[PDB]
Design a binder for this molecule. Structure first.
Ligand SMILES: CCN1CCC(Nc2ccccc2F)CC1
Length: 171
């Protein structure tokens, strides 16, 4: 049976209970925490690519008011559906299962300025989503896992001083 497990879930949860925030910039910013998963039940012999995208969680934006995140207006038009290809792609099931799959290099941006960055809209809540794509499959079979522990709001600057502090503490 295919299982994809979130690594460092108790670290994600510490951020999620404050409401998690990820910085977006012109040139793109790496995430902290880093999204990492453990995989079992792939065909060790088969070849697969790992994809990461970010799903919009709400039909509204958010605002940090009196130390509380609250609904903050109508959404911006959906961000362009950007997909990040894990740099080990394509590779054997055995490769993906022998050690946690780490998306350490992905960069979140608020400007389309290339370099395989992911464009997100400031003050919008997103949920990371990993896809496993079997290579050479005439059926183009894909599997999708969502990680609700990893939800965050995209921000141009941290709003919660406690998130600023957690980021420095654990990073
Ligand atoms: C005290 C509770 N806390 C335990 C440690 C933390 N884990 C963690 C910290 C830094 C790097 C990697 C990690 F997994 C998750 C929650």
């Amino acid at each position: 049976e295919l299982r994809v497990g979130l690594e460092e879930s108790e670290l994600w949860l510490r951020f999620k209970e404050l409401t998690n925030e990820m910085i977006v910039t012109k040139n793109g910013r790496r995430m902290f925490p880093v999204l990492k998963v453990n995989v079992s039940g792939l065909d060790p012999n088969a070849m697969y690519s790992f994809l990461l995208d970010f799903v919009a969680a709400d039909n509204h934006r958010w605002k940090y008011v009196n130390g509380e995140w609250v609904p903050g207006g109508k959404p911006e038009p959906q961000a362009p559906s950007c997909v990040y290809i894990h740099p080990d792609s394509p590779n054997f099931g055995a490769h993906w299962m022998k050690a946690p799959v780490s998306f350490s290099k992905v960069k979140l941006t608020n400007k389309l300025n290339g370099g395989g960055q992911i464009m997100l809209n400031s003050l919008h809540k997103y949920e990371p989503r990993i896809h496993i794509v079997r290579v050479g499959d005439p059926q183009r079979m894909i599997t999708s896992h969502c990680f609700p522990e990893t939800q965050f709001i995209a921000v141009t600057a941290y709003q919660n001083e406690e998130i600023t502090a957690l980021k420095i503490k654990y990073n």
